[PDB]
């Protein structure tokens, strides 16, 4: 829950899956909220396949069923990402904001942060699987209008965590993400630059003394 209140939900995921398997209730907020926390972190951290096996490697999440509004709203969303429902997905996103994030102490810091990130994921997965889409159809899949759809996308693309471009004349969405040798090359040099920097300052400091 400390990892949940700060921006690293990756750690939070790793601790809270253990907490499902065995829960210790005294002095710790009740088990339906603990389900809601596992599900929040699950959506953010994982992708389709991983997500599905996580909530089948937790039988308890499914057998607990939605028994509170916050649990219901997060669980509806969990299913739709991994089942690759986009249709009812876009409404569920609004429900999670209302009934989980603002009511919760720790996710009220993440009310704007979550909604922003979660939209990247749902788009990401669809675009990776496609070379090209049409915009109107992509808008319909989610349940938005064509023009509305760009706006959300157009914040994610220059941050370059979505690796795509949008023709507005063909109306096609192009996907030009390297996933080959070129991607591994592109990542590696950043780390190797980092190594150069670490040595540049430490080198100087020892030589002068």
């Amino acid at each position: 829950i400390h990892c949940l209140a700060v921006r690293n939900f990756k750690e939070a995921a790793k601790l809270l899956v253990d907490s499902l398997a065995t829960f210790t209730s005294i002095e710790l907020t009740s088990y339906e909220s603990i389900a809601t926390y596992a599900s929040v972190t699950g959506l953010f951290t994982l992708e389709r396949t991983d997500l599905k096996s996580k909530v089948i490697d937790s039988p308890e999440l499914l057998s607990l069923i939605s028994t509170t509004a916050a649990l219901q709203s997060i669980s509806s969303l969990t299913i739709s990402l991994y089942a690759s429902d986009y249709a009812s997905y876009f409404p569920y996103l609004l429900e999670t904001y209302a009934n989980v994030l603002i009511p919760c102490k720790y996710l009220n810091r993440h009310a704007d942060f979550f909604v922003r990130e979660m939209r990247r994921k749902v788009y990401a997965q669809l675009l990776e699987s496609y070379k090209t889409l049409s915009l109107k159809s992509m808008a319909s899949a989610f349940g938005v209008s064509v023009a509305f759809l760009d706006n959300d996308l157009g914040k994610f693309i220059p941050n370059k965590q979505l690796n795509c471009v949008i023709d507005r004349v063909n109306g096609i969405v192009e996907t030009n993400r390297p996933d080959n040798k070129n991607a591994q090359y592109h990542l590696l040099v950043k780390q190797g630059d980092g190594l150069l920097t670490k040595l540049q300052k430490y080198g100087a400091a020892v030589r002068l003394t």
């Binding site: 190797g192 150069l196 020892v206």
Partner: protein
């Protein structure tokens, strides 16, 4: 006779022994030491284990006139069995700088005693060649399809060595050179890399001027040579192939490994930089204390 051959393997002893026997007949100036060649055959690889001198006279007036002492050859072979009963005639060595046309007539005489076509191993005594100082031929008789009669001719085979391990360390023991024509570290193979390219230049020169010699000085148009030359071009790359583009991608790959390896080495030495500073740092105190 075996009419199947592929390679000639040579023991190191053979070369050295013919040079010794050469100076002790005191041969030079078209008087060339010729002895018998001993070893294993009925094998595509001719494996030459030993060699010995024969009493031989070479006339320098005519090399088609020669003396060979035939009787001696049988007696010597019986003593070869005393040493090891698996050494027989498989040819004869020549000590000269190169092939003579009297060597074809000489080769006739050793056919009588060989179960294999007889070997000519030129042991140079000036030690030329950019590989081994030995050239190797075996005499073959064949029809020639160029419209010329049946020749017996010496056709080239590769030269290789097979050295006993026991003997080979004697070569290392004798040799005080740290070797610059054989593999070692980076710098040593950096010479080996340049050396090979300079070997290709010399070999590439000789073909060009042979081709000039054929159509102005009228040396035989030999189809068998020129056929292997046609295959040099067909096996030669062409720019703009996706195979030679893959070479560019493959360059990136190994250079990057060098790039990270170079960083790794730089890290490790910077640990020793700090160590030595900690050694100086302590030794300030010891000095100050004294």
């Amino acid at each position: 006779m075996s009419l199947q051959h592929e390679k000639v393997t040579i023991a190191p002893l053979v070369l050295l022994s013919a040079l010794d026997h050469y100076e002790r007949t005191q041969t030079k100036e078209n008087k060339r030491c010729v002895g018998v060649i001993l070893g294993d055959a009925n094998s595509s690889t001719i494996r030459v284990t030993n060699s010995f001198a024969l009493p031989f006279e070479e006339d320098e007036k005519n090399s088609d006139v020669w003396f060979l002492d035939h009787n001696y050859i049988e007696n010597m072979n019986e003593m070869c069995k005393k040493i090891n009963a698996k050494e027989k005639l498989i040819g004869w060595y020549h000590s000269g700088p190169k092939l003579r046309a009297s060597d074809l007539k000489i080769n006739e005489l050793f056919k009588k005693y060989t179960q294999n076509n007889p070997l000519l191993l030129i042991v140079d005594v000036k030690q030329q060649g950019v590989g081994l100082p030995t050239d190797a031929y075996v005499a073959i008789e064949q029809v020639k399809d160029d419209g010329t009669s049946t020749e017996k001719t010496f056709l080239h085979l590769p030269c290789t060595i097979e050295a006993e391990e026991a003997e080979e360390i004697g070569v290392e023991h004798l040799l005080r050179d740290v070797r610059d024509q054989a593999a070692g570290g980076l710098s040593i193979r950096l010479t080996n890399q340049l050396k090979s390219l300079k070997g290709l230049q010399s070999k590439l020169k000789d073909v060009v001027e042979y081709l000039d010699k054929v159509i102005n000085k009228e040396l035989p148009i030999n189809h068998t040579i020129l056929g292997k030359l046609q295959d040099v071009f067909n096996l030669l790359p062409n720019l703009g192939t996706p195979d030679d583009d893959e070479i560019d991608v493959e360059n990136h790959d190994r250079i990057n490994i060098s790039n990270n390896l170079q960083k790794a080495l730089t890290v490790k030495t910077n640990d020793e930089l700090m160590v030595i500073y900690i050694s100086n740092l302590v030794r300030s105190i010891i000095a100050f204390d004294d």
